[PDB]
């Protein structure tokens, strides 16, 4: 189908050229259900953390973005306690020109540079801007606590 063929193509692509600090692929024979491992970007507050994400592709992929959620609890203004990720390209800015590699690169980028002006957890966004020192202390603590 349009969908399985696209997924198989994107799987070959990502296996050959994975994003830095990231891997991703099917959980089993069902090619629509992937898992990903992302390492906290070196130099970031998440460094040393190992984060797991679930990825579910639609039967209408690539016309609907993949559903991507953090399984691993993380302290981040764009990622909530249910692992929902506030990322334009996962919602209104998706297009069929994008790929699961580009999504995962953008999420890696998001861990490096959060978007506090477009927050999912406003309290954390406010903290990032007014008391960065403390935000970063907490992000580090949660990384060690939950992602190690």
From Swiss-Prot:
Sorted alphabetically, the keyword list is: Acetylation, ATP-binding, Nucleotide-binding, Phosphoprotein, Transferase, Ubl conjugation, Ubl conjugation pathway
Q: Name one GO cellular component term.
A: nucleus
* Every UBC core domain range: 2-148
Q: Please state which portion of the whole protein this structure contains, as first and last residue out of the total length.
A: 55 to 201 of 201
> GO MF terms on file?
ATP binding; ISG15 transferase activity; ubiquitin conjugating enzyme activity; ubiquitin-protein transferase activity
- Name the residues annotated as catalytic in the UniProt entry: 86 (glycyl thioester intermediate)
Specify the species. Homo sapiens (Human)
As for family, the record states:
Belongs to the ubiquitin-conjugating enzyme family.
Official protein name in the record: Ubiquitin-conjugating enzyme E2 E2
């Amino acid at each position: 189908s349009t969908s399985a063929k696209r997924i198989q193509k994107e799987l070959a692509e990502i296996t050959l050229d994975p994003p830095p600090n990231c891997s991703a692929g099917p959980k089993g024979d069902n090619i629509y259900e992937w898992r990903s491992t992302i390492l906290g970007p070196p130099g970031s507050v998440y460094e040393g953390g190992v984060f797991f994400l679930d990825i579910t592709f639609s039967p209408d992929y690539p016309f609907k973005p993949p559903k991507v959620t953090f399984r691993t609890r993380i302290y981040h203004c764009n990622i909530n306690s249910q692992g929902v990720i506030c990322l334009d390209i996962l919602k209104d800015n998706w297009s069929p020109a994008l790929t699961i590699s580009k999504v995962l690169l953008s999420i890696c980028s998001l861990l490096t540079d959060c978007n506090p002006a477009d927050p999912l957890v406003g309290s954390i966004a406010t903290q990032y801007m007014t008391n960065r020192a403390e935000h970063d202390r907490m992000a580090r603590q949660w990384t060690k606590r939950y992602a190690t």
